[PDB]
Amino acid sequence: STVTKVIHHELEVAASADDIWTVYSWPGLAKHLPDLLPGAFEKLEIIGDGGVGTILDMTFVPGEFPHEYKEKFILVDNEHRLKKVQMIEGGYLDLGVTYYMDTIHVVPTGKDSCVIKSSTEYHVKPEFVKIVEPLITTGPLAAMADAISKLVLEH
Amino acid sequence: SQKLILTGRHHQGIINQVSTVTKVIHHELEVAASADDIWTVYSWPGLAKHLPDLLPGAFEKLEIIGDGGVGTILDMTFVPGEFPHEYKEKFILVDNEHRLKKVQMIEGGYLDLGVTYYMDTIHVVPTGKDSCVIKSSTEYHVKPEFVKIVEPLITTGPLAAMADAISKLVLEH
Amino acid sequence: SQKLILTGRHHQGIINQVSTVTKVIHHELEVAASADDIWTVYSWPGLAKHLPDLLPGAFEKLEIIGDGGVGTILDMTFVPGEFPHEYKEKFILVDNEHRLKKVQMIEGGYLDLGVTYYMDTIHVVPTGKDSCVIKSSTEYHVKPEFVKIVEPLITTGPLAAMADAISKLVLEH
Amino acid sequence: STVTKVIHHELEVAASADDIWTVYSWPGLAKHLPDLLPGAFEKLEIIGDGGVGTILDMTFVPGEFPHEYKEKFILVDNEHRLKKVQMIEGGYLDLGVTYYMDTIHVVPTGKDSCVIKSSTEYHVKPEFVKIVEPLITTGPLAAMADAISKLVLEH
């Protein structure tokens, strides 16, 4: 007995899908997350080399919600330019959520242009659907999008 | 495999942080034991380190900093699924004369969900020769846009569970 | 099962703590690469978070606090069996002009074994167009009754292993 | 290739072996160790109910050696009044020691008197025997002895 919710975010960028994708899939990116997102993390623990299987423990600055959660780099698909990251411990999972997934899909539009289609799907017990829907947003994915965009839009 | 942890090093508006509304919730457990007996357990400095005993399977981890008297800090981590997952707590007042105890959330828990101040007060008042009310109340200050979110969570539960568990101990010979 | 952690809250003599003897140990790695190339790696603020890469299987856990420039603190935990098991370290000086770097043990490690002060200095000095000496030295202050105990442990190893590992990187095209 | 060393400590006490033994074997004793040894521990983590199987993580105040080690309540023998506690992680095991055991044996002398025979045995690689023998002493056991003694010598 869980309700499924899926939220979406899109971002057009004046760079090739391939260029934006190398950065998203780049295993060194994990240890550079504080560089892309200054002041977003109080503490970031990386278990693994940044490729699939890598777990990230994330604790945020006092006041913010999810104060702390773990994450797993679960899947990568280079041909489709697709990446799935799962919340595995803490955060919304202590708040009636039984499943939490992020999908990032970089789809080309023209020769030197693409969309970043970021989505997150979750499953919540009906009792917690109203407690938790004003909390879960597309924020963390939109932040990844804006940072990667700007870092790559440098000739 | 390779553990690597990275911690780097902006404040909010001076009016924004005080821009709250007070909510007060009460709980009354009237029990058939003297106020003195209930109070001696509540004010017992050894109670902290026996909370796992009193409340089995509530804590995944319990850290206590200090002797157990006023000033003591309790860092409480709860089992996966449960929420508030972790918060710190402080013993503000242990007033024997009035049978009055105050404990405050000082970090984590609802403080990361719009709450700016959170106080438990426990007052044990006589009702007869061998009976008393345990009056537990919690006062919190919330950003009003968060009251919808945080109110179903902030129940009278954890201090109600305390009062019952202490009462049970006493009512046993 | 039940985790329960308890942390409570006396100082030593003012002359006792300064009652040490200085020991200085040197290491010189003269390599066939320019001092500029060796220095750019040593002074590179990204080097901290790539120490697991540079030195595989040395760390069980590496925490870095700060950007990587002066002021940065490194908390290093090593695999079971190895000793110093854990210590904190601080970037005191990164002097481009002199190709001079100082890093200090500020907590743990040999500081719990009679040592009261511990400084690594790395000075990269030219020897020719494409050669230099990496002069690493460590100065520590020990309580003299502990010198027998701590001297076989405090070797020139960890800063010798650094110098070689950096040299290898550079000497590759 | 390890050298075996065994050190001993004895303490006569004007109380019955049985009285001193109830306290040594008392599963609630673990959580009372900071009470017996004020200021000895910076931080004491107890995993378990204080009976056999219990692991204790011990971190000490800056300056002291073993800064931190884990311990296991390995064996109890009530008839012989005997207790064995093993160092399982950290401390001397990061310093060439491959085995570390404490035995506490409370043996009665007269009707209302006993000895506390505390010993510790360790195995060290020959390279580390000289580095580590000025460090390992009977200190932690003698402290247990003096504290338990005095707490029990109260009519």
From Swiss-Prot, chains B, C:
pH-related activity note: Optimum pH is 7.0.
Enzymatic reactions: (4-hydroxyphenyl)acetaldehyde + dopamine = (S)-norcoclaurine + H2O
Organs and tissues of expression: Expressed most abundantly in the rhizomes and to a lesser extent in petioles, roots, leaves and flower buds.
Record keywords, A-Z: Alkaloid metabolism, Hydrolase, Signal
Record-listed dopamine binding positions: Y87, K88, E89
UniProt record similarity statement: Belongs to the BetVI family.
Cell membrane recorded as keyword: no
EC class of the enzyme, as a word: hydrolase
Active-site positions on this chain: K101
Protein name per its UniProtKB record: S-norcoclaurine synthase
GO CC terms in record: cytoplasm; nucleus
Biological-process GO terms, alphabetical: abscisic acid-activated signaling pathway; alkaloid metabolic process; defense response
Impact after mutating Y87F: Partial loss of activity
Effect ascribed to mutating K101A: Loss of activity
Known EC number: 3.5.99.14
GO molecular function terms attached to this record: (S)-norcoclaurine synthase activity; abscisic acid binding; protein phosphatase inhibitor activity; signaling receptor activity
Thermal activity profile: Optimum temperature is 40 degrees Celsius.
Binding site residues for (4-hydroxyphenyl)acetaldehyde: D120
Note: May be a member of a small family of three to five members.
Function: Involved in the biosynthesis of the common precursor of all benzylisoquinoline alkaloids such as morphine, sanguinarine, codeine or berberine. Condenses dopamine and 4-hydroxyphenylacetaldehyde.
Organism of derivation: Thalictrum flavum subsp. glaucum (Yellow meadow rue)
Subunit and partners: Concentration-dependent dimerization, but mainly monomeric at concentrations around 10 uM.
